[PDB]
Write a protein that binds this ligand. Sequence first.
Ligand SMILES: CCCCCCCCOCCOCCOCCOCCO
Lengths: 11, 277
Amino acid sequence: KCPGRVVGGCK
Amino acid sequence: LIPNISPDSFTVAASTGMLSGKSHEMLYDAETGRKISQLDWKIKNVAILKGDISWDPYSFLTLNARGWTSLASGSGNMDNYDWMNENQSEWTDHSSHPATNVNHANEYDLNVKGWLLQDENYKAGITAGYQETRFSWTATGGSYSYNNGAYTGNFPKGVRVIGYNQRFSMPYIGLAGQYRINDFELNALFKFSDWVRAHDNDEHYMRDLTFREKTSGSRYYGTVINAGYYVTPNAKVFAEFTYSKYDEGKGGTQTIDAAGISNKNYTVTAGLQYRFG
Ligand SMILES: CCCCCCCCOCCOCCOCCOCCO
């Protein structure tokens, strides 16, 4: 889902 | 009636100088309004060329096309903050990208001025026009603090991280005044819109994501002031300062709400204006 952040992988 | 086509009804101007400013690419929770994401895009230094063509078809009416454009890539900056934790006010993530370029920028402004008051020294009128402004940045390299400082480090030098474009367009209304005493001339303009339409485009290269946002019905405020000296009856050397503020609007987000898109910018230029005839 990670909004905005340069890299994802928000778990 | 048939418009004035005399050469002296026509005036052109060009100036050069610098553009600077700051944009914001915003994201909010569409239920609480909580700010979850904020990217600040800086325009530090961009060389610009500014042009103006003005025609007086009638004594009371001036038609004007003006704009400016970046002469080359300029320097900028970007910071990317994210608030992933709804409980906590401080951001969870921050990246900083000093190696951000302003690829290009421009503005075009097509307008009419209806002159309602005039004497030998002073002319004043109401202006209305259509205006659009665009900026493009590429953020490369930089450093990061993620997951509350648990991960910190740098991105690889010169690798592009995020590509971002904004555009704002609007009809506007304004007041324009022109003062002339002997060879000195001052022009001042104040512009406003309550119906800006904004779009942006965001390429997150390390996530293979493209984001698109759009808002409408937001506000704009702008000023133009210039002062100069006639060195011939037809030629004026001048300096000009402008300021523009595109307020943040509230709109939708797309991935291939609630998003906010905003900008402020300044220009400082100097040049020459020439009236034909
Ligand atoms: C065009 C007749 C004026 C009617 C006033 C309505 C105001 C609405 O704003 C429209 C702005 O667009 C005007 C186009 O300006 C012409 C610029 O080019 C002329 C330079 O040669």
